[PDB]
Amino acid sequence: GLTYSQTMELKDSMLQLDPNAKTWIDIEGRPEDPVEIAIYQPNNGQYIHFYREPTDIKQFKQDSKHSHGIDIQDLFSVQPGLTSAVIESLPKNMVLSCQGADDIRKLLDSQNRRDIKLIDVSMQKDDARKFEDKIWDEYKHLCRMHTGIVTQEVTPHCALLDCLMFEAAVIGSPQIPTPRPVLSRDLVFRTGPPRVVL
């Protein structure tokens, strides 16, 4: 989990959300073993976005090749404990928009956050991904974690970009205010290997 100072920093950064604004949530991975989480406020562009190493490797490899394309080695350096830390400090009685509520409901409940309510926009599969190509063209650089070829060859599913494209689908245009991450990379990732000296 997080250190005392990491925990103070996270809570401080999370208060940059307005607890009342429209807020999307999306996860990749099963709710008992999530590997990527995004919480996004379209109007101001702010988002919480972080990763998690999986515990079930066989199911992860399946999800990797047919959904999110994440290589497990790229998760080794991510900061543990962020999922429970973030969910614990989301505002009381917060309301979240999502596309498909079943898994996210389980995840919040497992964290005793039954006070958090979900609004399932329940779009149809392809309506939800109308602007998938344009959103990936513009905002690919915001998440480079989907490195594997995914087959169902299709575009990998990213918690962050899914939130952005669902927002685009609800409003009818890929034109959204610039997304800005509220978490620092040093909170999402551990230090990683030293610079190779060249």
**Residue 165 makes contact with Zn ion by CB under 5 A:** no
Minimum distance from residue 3 beta carbon to Mn ion (Å): 30
Among 10, 26, 51, 146, binds Mn ion (CB under 5 A): 26
143 binds, among Zn ion, Mn ion, none (CB under 5 to 8 A by kind): Zn ion
26 binds, among Mn ion, Zn ion, none (CB under 5 to 8 A by kind): Mn ion
Any known ligand binding at 28? Answer: yes
Any known ligand binding at 98? Answer: no
Among 35, 94, 107, 143, binds Zn ion (CB under 5 A): 143
Minimum distance from residue 100 beta carbon to Mn ion (Å): 8
**Residue 162 makes contact with Mn ion by CB under 5 A:** yes
Minimum distance from residue 158 beta carbon to Zn ion (Å): 3
Minimum distance from residue 139 beta carbon to Zn ion (Å): 10
162 binds, among Mn ion, Zn ion, none (CB under 5 to 8 A by kind): Mn ion
CA distance 23 to 17: 9
